Amino acid sequence: VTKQRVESHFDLELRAAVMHDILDMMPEGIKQNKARTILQHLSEAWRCWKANIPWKVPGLPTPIENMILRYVKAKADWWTNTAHYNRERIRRGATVDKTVCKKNLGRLTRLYLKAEQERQHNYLKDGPYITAEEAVAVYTTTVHWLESRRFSPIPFPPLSYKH
C-alpha cells in the first residue's frame, strides 16, 4: 500500500469491517437489513460530522446507532490525526505536492471552524468572562485619560462636508 491508495484503501477496509460486524450481528433482519441503506446512513453521518450539523435521525434501532457512532468516531479521529501529521510534514518542508497542500488546507480549516462554533456558543452559555468590576475599571479609566487629554469626540460626518 502506497500513499496514493491509502485513503481509498482504508475506506474499503472500514466499510467492509462495518459490514461484517453489524450486518452479521444486528440481523434478524435476516434477509438483508438493507445494509446498503445502513451504509448510506453511515456516509451521511460522516458528512454531517464534517459540516458540524447535528445528525439525529430518530427511528434507528439504538444498537445500530451505537455501531454507527463507534465507526464514525473511528474515522473522524483518523482524519484528524492524519491532518496533524501532514501539516507537520509541510511545515518541516519535507516534501512538496499540489494536492496534499490543498487537501490539508481544507481539512485544517474545517477543524478550525468547528473549534470556533464551539467557542462562540460557549461564550453565550457561560456569560461574558470580563466580569463587571473589570469592565467598570477599564471604562472609567479610559474616560479619565481622554478627558485629561481634552479630546474632542469625533462627530457623525456631515453631508455637505468639505472633504
Binding site: 447535528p54 439525529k56 446507532e65 468516531k73 464551539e118 456558543h121
Partner: protein
C-alpha cells in the same frame, strides 16, 4: 422515562451532541419515551360490550377494541360521555344500512372524543358482510367522526372504506323493526325518529388497560 416508557430508539441527543460542537456533550445513550394512548392500545386487547338503549329497543354492541383501537376508544369515550343520548339514526336505506350518531340529528356534524377527525382503520379481516356490521361513517379517508352505521346485510363495497369496529350481537328484532321503518326516499330519513336514548358500557377494555398500565407505573415507581 420509566421502563414502560422506554421506546425502541434513543432520543438522539448523544448523536447530535457528538456530530456537532454547538451542543453540550452528553455521553450516555438515552432511549426515548415511546408513547401514550398508542401504548394503551397495546394493553387493550379485549373487546367492548355496549347496550344501546334506543326507542326501538336495546342493541348489544361487540367491538374489536384490540383491532380498531382508536375507533373503538373514540366511540367508548363518547359512550361514557353518553354523547349519543338524543342522537338519531338520521339515515335509513332499505337493505343497505341504518346510519346515525349526531347530537344535531342532521348527520353532517358530530365529534371525535378528542374533537379531531381520526384516522380510518380498515384491516384485512374486517369486512362489511352479513347483518350487524358496525362501520364508521366518515366523509372519506381518515376523517372519522361521531357518525356510525350498521349494515343490514353484506355490503362489501364499504370494505376498505368504512371502519368497522365490531358487530351487533343483540337486538336483532330491534334492528328488524328499524329496517321496517319508512324512510324518505329523497332524504332516506326515518319517518319515525329512531334515537339512541341511553348508553350502558358493560365492559370497558380501556378501563382494564389503564388499570394494568397504572399498576405497572406504581410498581416500577
Amino acid at each position: 422515562v420509566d421502563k414502560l416508557n422506554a421506546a425502541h430508539y434513543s432520543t438522539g441527543k448523544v448523536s447530535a451532541s457528538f456530530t456537532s460542537t454547538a451542543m453540550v456533550p452528553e455521553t450516555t445513550h438515552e432511549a426515548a419515551a415511546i408513547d401514550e394512548d398508542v401504548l394503551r392500545y397495546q394493553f387493550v386487547k379485549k373487546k367492548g360490550y355496549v347496550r344501546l338503549h334506543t326507542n326501538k329497543g336495546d342493541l348489544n354492541l361487540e367491538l374489536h377494541c384490540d383491532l380498531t383501537p382508536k375507533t373503538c376508544e373514540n366511540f367508548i369515550r363518547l359512550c361514557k360521555k353518553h354523547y349519543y343520548d338524543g342522537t338519531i339514526f338520521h339515515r335509513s336505506i332499505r337493505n343497505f344500512v341504518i346510519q346515525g350518531g349526531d347530537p344535531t340529528g342532521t348527520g353532517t356534524g358530530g365529534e371525535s372524543y378528542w374533537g379531531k377527525p381520526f384516522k380510518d382503520e380498515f384491516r384485512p379481516n374486517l369486512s362489511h358482510t352479513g347483518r350487524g356490521i358496525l362501520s364508521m361513517a366518515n366523509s372519506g379517508p381518515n376523517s372519522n367522526r361521531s357518525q356510525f352505521f350498521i349494515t343490514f346485510r353484506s355490503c362489501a363495497y364499504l370494505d376498505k372504506k368504512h371502519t368497522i369496529f365490531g358487530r351487533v350481537v343483540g337486538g336483532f328484532d330491534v334492528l328488524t323493526a328499524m329496517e321496517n321503518v319508512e324512510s324518505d326516499p329523497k332524504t332516506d330519513r326515518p319517518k319515525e325518529e329512531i334515537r339512541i336514548d341511553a348508553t350502558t358500557v358493560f365492559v370497558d377494555p380501556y378501563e382494564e388497560a389503564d388499570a394494568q398500565i397504572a399498576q405497572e407505573r406504581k410498581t416500577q415507581l
